[PDB]
Design a binder for this molecule. Structure first.
Ligand SMILES: [Ca+2]
Ligand SMILES: [Ca+2]
Ligand SMILES: [Ca+2]
Ligand SMILES: [Ca+2]
Ligand SMILES: [Ca+2]
Ligand SMILES: [Ca+2]
Ligand SMILES: [Ca+2]
Ligand SMILES: [Ca+2]
Ligand SMILES: [Cl-]
Ligand SMILES: [Cl-]
Lengths: 5, 236, 236, 5
């Protein structure tokens, strides 16, 4: 999964 | 609510304790109580709110993905019938996840967003609104999926518009907003070229403004820039 | 209870799904429901029960320890007064932990232990009884602490007596019982010499019986023996 | 903390 903050 | 009898300051104190103890459901309940006191949140307080719910919904999302994968396998060619239990349990977790998202969206709508006038606060809450609609979109399959996606998009877009007018390109909130909106484009909106363009433009504009920053601000901005680069590497 | 309308087999199926999803509170609720159906549990089913509650209480214990440490620091010389909130929140977590322990002990008393006639089942449940009284003892400070300790001791001792008569010295349940009872002696009963003697005798008697075992049984027994050795290394 | 199972 891609990075999120 | 449940927390109506506890002082605002005590709720905040206990949220911080719950964080230290990794009791994120408790942390979220304390911060819900604090929001429902009706006063605006400080920067530190809005961070406590976001951390608490991020961790609660994050665990739900991970569990949902496990169960969804099992369910998908159960529906393949050659799979033995096992009854309604996988679907029922995936549905249970899904409903809990949707409830948490609805809770956060409710706090934002009653009344955090409307009383947030400073750019930093307003953008922070609008990013949250986009994020929690995005989480609803991840599990949506019915006649409201389009509308959920559009709600996420609209919130992110308003946040982007404010952030570009009012914040420097290195500002961490601006960077994190762009990171997440780019993921929305890739994973939810079926727009990988938009996702890539946004991540690259954001990274580049930040790079050009790093010279203005202190050592500590530089550290924060570069850390988020590395997440943009990580996504670009995944996608290209 | 809450699970009264769900089939026994569906509760078991859903406990296994909840395990895969790392949803241990759900797993524990499903297995409580299964126990309350009134039938004896298979080996696999008793393992699901134990895993679920171990993980729930394990998280509570870790949180309690964090909060207790903060509380102890708040009571030192030179510590600034911060009000009742640390104690209140430690008390909240403690009460939740005690409730989970009471729930498990209740299942064992109504009616798992009394219907368990085979050595392997009876020992398994008596070990659980000792473990959950031990967890109550870890947080006990009042006029019942002695009685809680004695309840743990009594359960472990009955389990030990059966295990020595009825099970080989390499049996995993026997080994794990001894491991935990040895920790009870060290950490709860203030008897480190008893703890050390029990761990060493258990290890040695197992070592002498390994020759009787298959490759797979050998792997299980040696893994637990290594935990005995790890504790001995910590304590000597 | 010591090991338990
Ligand atoms: Ca007040
Ligand atoms: Ca649904
Ligand atoms: Ca305002
Ligand atoms: Ca500005
Ligand atoms: Ca039935
Ligand atoms: Ca107490
Ligand atoms: Ca029986
Ligand atoms: Ca035997
Ligand atoms: Cl269910
Ligand atoms: Cl509390």
């Amino acid at each position: 999964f891609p990075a999120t903050v | 609510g449940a927390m109506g009898s506890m002082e605002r300051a005590s709720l905040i104190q206990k949220a911080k304790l719950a964080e230290q103890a990794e009791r994120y459901e408790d942390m979220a309940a304390f911060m819900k109580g604090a929001v429902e006191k009706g006063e605006e949140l400080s920067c530190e307080e809005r961070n406590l709110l976001s951390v608490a719910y991020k961790n609660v919904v994050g665990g739900q999302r991970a569990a949902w993905r496990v169960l969804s994968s099992i369910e998908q396998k159960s529906n393949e060619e050659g799979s033995e019938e096992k009854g309604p239990e996988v679907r029922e349990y995936r549905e249970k977790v899904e409903t809990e996840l949707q409830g948490v998202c609805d809770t956060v969206l409710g706090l934002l709508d009653s009344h955090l967003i409307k009383e947030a006038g400073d750019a930093e606060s307003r953008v922070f809450y609008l990013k949250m609104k986009g994020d929690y609609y995005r989480y609803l979109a991840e599990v949506a399959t019915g006649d409201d999926k389009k509308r959920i996606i559009d709600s996420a998009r609209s919130a992110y877009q308003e946040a982007m518009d404010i952030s570009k007018k009012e914040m420097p390109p290195t500002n961490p909130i601006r960077l994190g907003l762009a990171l997440n909106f780019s993921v929305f484009h890739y994973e939810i909106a079926n727009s990988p070229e938009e996702a890539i363009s946004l991540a690259k433009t954001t990274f580049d504009e930040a790079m050009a403004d790093l010279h203005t920053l202190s050592e500590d601000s530089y550290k924060d901005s570069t850390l988020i820039m590395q997440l943009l680069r990580d996504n670009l590497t995944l996608w290209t």
